[PDB]
Amino acid sequence: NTIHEFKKSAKTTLIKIDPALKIKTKKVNTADQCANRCTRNKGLPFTCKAFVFDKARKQCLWFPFNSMSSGVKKEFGHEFDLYENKDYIRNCIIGKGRSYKGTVSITKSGIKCQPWSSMIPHEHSFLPSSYRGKDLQENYCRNPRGEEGGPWCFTSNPEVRYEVCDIPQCSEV
Amino acid sequence: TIHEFKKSAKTTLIKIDPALKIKTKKVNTADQCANRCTRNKGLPFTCKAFVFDKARKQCLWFPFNSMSSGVKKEFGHEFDLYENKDYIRNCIIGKGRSYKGTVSITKSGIKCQPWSSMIPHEHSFLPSSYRGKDLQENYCRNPRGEEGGPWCFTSNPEVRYEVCDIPQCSEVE
Numbered sequence: 001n002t003i004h005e006f007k008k009s010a011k012t013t014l015i016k017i018d019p020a021l022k023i024k025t026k027k028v029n030t031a032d033q034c035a036n037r038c039t040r041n042k043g044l045p046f047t048c049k050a051f052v053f054d055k056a057r058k059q060c061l062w063f064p065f066n067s068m069s070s071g072v073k074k075e076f077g078h079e080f081d082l083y084e085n086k087d088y089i090r091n092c093i094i095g096k097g098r099s100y101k102g103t104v105s106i107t108k109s110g111i112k113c114q115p116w117s118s119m120i121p122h123e124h125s126f127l128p129s130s131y132r133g134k135d136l137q138e139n140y141c142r143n144p145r146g147e148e149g150g151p152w153c154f155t156s157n158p159e160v161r162y163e164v165c166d167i168p169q170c171s172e173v
Numbered sequence: 174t175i176h177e178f179k180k181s182a183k184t185t186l187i188k189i190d191p192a193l194k195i196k197t198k199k200v201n202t203a204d205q206c207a208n209r210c211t212r213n214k215g216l217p218f219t220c221k222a223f224v225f226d227k228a229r230k231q232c233l234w235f236p237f238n239s240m241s242s243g244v245k246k247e248f249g250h251e252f253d254l255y256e257n258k259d260y261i262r263n264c265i266i267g268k269g270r271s272y273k274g275t276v277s278i279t280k281s282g283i284k285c286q287p288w289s290s291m292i293p294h295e296h297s298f299l300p301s302s303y304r305g306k307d308l309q310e311n312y313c314r315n316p317r318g319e320e321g322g323p324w325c326f327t328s329n330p331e332v333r334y335e336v337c338d339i340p341q342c343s344e345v346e
């Protein structure tokens with residue numbers, strides 16, 4: 001029951017710009033059944049980096065790519081949920097982390113981050129719509145204006161308006 | 174929740190830098206430390222790792238792992254080390270000499286042949302003959318660091334070896 005180990009993007013599937021990349025699909029019952037086969041990677045002529053579940057056609061679509069791969073695009077759909085394997089979503093930062101899209105949602109000192117769509121505890125104007133491509137979803141640490149400290153978030157502690165999250169540099173030698 | 178973590182049996186982490194924080198508590202099983210780590214409540218930092226002391230039945234939580242500056246692995250028969258995968262780099266630099274993540278599937282989807290096994294392919298790569306290199310479990314690895322990145326022997330008798338499909342850190346934005 002591994003569905004809680006993927007990063008969920010609602011109302012979304014990915015489209016094969018490229019004719020070259022490949023796909024598996026199976027009609028099924030629940031998105032769980034979909035996690036488990038991506039997690040286990042059985043019966044797949046490729047590495048499962050993401051799956052979509054189609055709540056209307058009850059289908060799973062397992063992918064050897066994700067939303068960040070070249071020659072692939074998101075497509076909208078009320079019936080689609082996308083789930084990307086945390087293993088192929090880069091979990092360190094490059095530079096100041098303008099493009100960090102990992103799922104760490106805790107500040108350096110352990111404070112659970114406050115949702116970008118929320119104004120509680122803290123009022124702010126970093127609307128997700130005002131920052132498209134900067135993936136200000138859920139309560140993830142993000143550095144949307146690409147500032148000095150790397151990814152930060154508003155804090156769910158009313159006494160701490162914000163704080164850096166402590167995410168490692170990919171390469172600093 | 175004790176599977177979002179990479180387990181090194183028989184291992185713990187000593188801190189040099191005695192300013193890095195640490196919480197410990199006498200708990201009952203290793204699972205009960207995973208959960209407290211995973212939801213990070215009551216720990217004044219970001220839990221990147223924990224150790225379970227099977228003797229003392231104690232847990233030791235850390236805001237660092239075995240790739241952190243200022244900390245050493247250490248053999249201890251009574252310990253087990255569990256590192257949060259968000260903080261083990263999931264991304265390859267160059268040939269992947271130092272790739273220590275948990276991916277175990279080849280690029281065309283075939284499950285990896287464990288290094289501690291000569292079936293179906295026989296080989297010159299035991300763990301302790303190649304120490305420092307983490308030829309642990311069935312993890313995609315690159316011990317001699319050679320052109321196409323981490324690879325493994327393959328559970329499929331027709332395919333001796335194949336590289337895995339681990340992204341470069343340079344792949345994405």
Ligand SMILES: O=S(=O)(O)CCCN1CCN(CCO)CC1
Binds near residue numbers: 124147149150162163
């Ligand atoms: O201006 S707001 O309070 O709405 C957001 C403030 C966050 N910034 C503060 C300075 N660094 C944070 C790192 O300490 C960059 C982001």
